[PDB]
Design a protein around this ligand. Structure first.
Ligand code: NGS
Length: 522
């Protein structure tokens, strides 16, 4: 038995459940048939991998598989009880059933989770077990940067597939950057017409120069909707990030006349890595209108109730030199230009609050926003803590803000996972091994009183250096599974050597899916 993430409670019992060629299942009709829909999708996956067919019964006595509603269980929790006679699953919500069925598949040979038939197995069974399971953290995330390099819909579906294996539930889509803007906005076509294309594939840094090759791409709104729907089937919600008002050089290049602090200078999509001073003019009324209208479009495309507005690495230099910005700073009664960033967010937060309930969104920010007078903005925000993350998360929690931990080290899984010279180019020097990732303890030394604010964990994947899907996958796996387990499994049940033995069994899964992965611990 090799389950990842490790469930909260597992007892191995006597004997095995034998599937046979077909069997009857009883599935609760409640919750507007949503649980039957989860089960129908599982039936497809089971048949693909094993050829087993499942029929429906109302009779518990005839049911070899039963899915029952238990309202007492948390939203992502389940019980999975396998005996010789019956598989019994209990959960309170569709996601719980989905995760129970993920665990069920993981109890079978790896091809079942892979969704691929092989010649190896003839008869299918499950070990008898009693499992009660629920995630430690409600937010178990992966972020992909497509601003730096663009991967496109097929690869994002693969990413979602990888996340779902390990019960991750939040995909953070970093779609906008200095070096590219990757989402069609109908009201602002130049964001893609200008911002989605640039004259270099590689991004310059240090002595590395731009390459003069035309490079880019973007998602249509139709593509966005398809991906959102795909992720929903695997109980992954998508949080879009429009990183503003820093990391916005592509947008400024598209609409300099009102977004630039210095509109008489040239503005182009950045062909370099690093930190740009070409930030949005937060004091220009048309810039405010632009941000509102972008948020409006996001609300149409992304149903999840959170939006990420970024706020990392936003130099104030260009604001200090802008008369609109200087006028606004005095008007808001501050002498710190950082407060223009916070005031900008406050205006957007207020705008969102004007909308009907279903269109309202909670806001997430990178932790640098804590350096402003956040009383301007209030504490009903979420802080994604990435730089000095432990300290930043604690500061957020002390202020009553929710926090998500995405520490640069070791949860930036674009970073090298080995010191071997033959590793592909990415950030870091090979210290972010699977072991290092797994050994991070999100709540170490966090006061009991602050722990409720810690909503979970996220691995982030920045693509300055990473251009090819094979390399993305190589760097993602298997470290993604370590973060997934950190998000799911209670700390007291986490053990690196145990994880290593279990994750080794997934090499077969990756091979069957044609996913690349780091081989260092395999
Ligand atoms: C929020 C955030 O991370 N902001 C930036 C990202 O745009 C950048 O891509 C990432 C690279 O990290 S690295 O791979 O560890 O050098 O580091 C930070 O400087």
């Amino acid at each position: 038995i090799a389950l990842t993430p490790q469930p909260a409670h597992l007892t191995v019992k006597d004997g095995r459940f034998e599937f046979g060629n077909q069997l009857k299942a009883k599935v609760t009709p409640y919750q507007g048939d949503s649980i039957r829909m989860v089960f129908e999708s599982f039936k497809k996956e089971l048949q693909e991998a094993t050829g087993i067919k499942v029929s429906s019964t109302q009779k518990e006595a005839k049911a070899r598989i039963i899915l029952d509603l238990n309202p007492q269980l948390p939203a992502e929790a389940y019980k999975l009880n396998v005996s010789k006679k019956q598989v019994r699953i209990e959960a309170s919500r569709p996601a719980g059933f989905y995760y129970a069925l993920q665990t069920l598949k993981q109890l079978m040979p790896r091809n079942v989770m892979a969704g691929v038939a092989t010649s190896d197995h003839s008869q299918w069974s499950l070990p008898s077990v009693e499992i009660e399971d629920a995630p430690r953290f409600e937010w178990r995330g992966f972020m992909l940067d497509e601003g730096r390099h663009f991967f496109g819909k097929d690869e994002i579906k693969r990413v979602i597939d990888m996340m779902a294996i390990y019960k991750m539930n939040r995909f953070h889509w970093h779609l906008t950057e200095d070096q590219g803007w990757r989402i069609e906005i109908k009201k602002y076509p130049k964001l893609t017409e200008t911002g989605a294309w640039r004259n270099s594939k590689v991004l310059a840094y240090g002595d590395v120069k731009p390459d003069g090759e035309r490079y880019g791409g973007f998602y249509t709104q139709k593509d966005i909707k398809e991906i959102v729907a795909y992720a929903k089937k695997k109980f992954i919600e998508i949080i879009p990030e429009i990183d503003i008002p820093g990391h916005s050089q592509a947008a400024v290049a598209a609409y300099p006349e009102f977004l630039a602090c210095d509109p008489r200078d040239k503005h182009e999509v950045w062909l370099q890595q690093g930190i740009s001073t070409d930030v949005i003019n937060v004091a220009n009324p048309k810039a405010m209108q632009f941000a509102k209208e972008v948020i409006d479009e996001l609300t149409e495309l992304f149903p999840f109730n959170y939006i990420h507005l970024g706020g990392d690495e936003c130099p104030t230099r260009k604001w200090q030199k802008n008369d609109e910005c200087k006028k606004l700073l005095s008007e808001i009664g501050s002498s710190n230009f950082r407060d223009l960033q916070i005031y900008f967010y406050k205006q957007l937060k207020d705008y969102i609050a004007t909308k009907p309930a279903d269109q309202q969104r909670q806001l997430i920010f990178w932790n640098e926003v804590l350096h402003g007078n956040t009383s301007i903005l209030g504490n009903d925000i979420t802080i994604m803590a990435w730089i000095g993350a432990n300290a930043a998360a604690k500061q957020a929690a002390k202020q009553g803000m929710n926090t998500i931990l995405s520490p640069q080290i070791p949860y930036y899984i674009n970073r090298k996972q080995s010191k071997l010279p033959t590793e592909p180019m990415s950030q870091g020097h090979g210290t972010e091994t699977v072991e290092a990732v797994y050994n991070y303890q999100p709540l170490k030394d966090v006061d009991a009183a602050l722990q409720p604010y810690y909503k979970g964990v996220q691995a982030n994947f920045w693509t300055e250096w990473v251009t090819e899907p094979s390399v993305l996958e190589y760097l993602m796996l298997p470290r993604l599974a370590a973060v997934a387990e950190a998000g799911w499994t209670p700390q007291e049940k986490r053990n690196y050597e145990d994880f290593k033995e279990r994750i080794r069994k997934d090499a077969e899964l990756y091979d069957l899916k044609g996913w690349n992965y780091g081989k260092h611990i395999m």
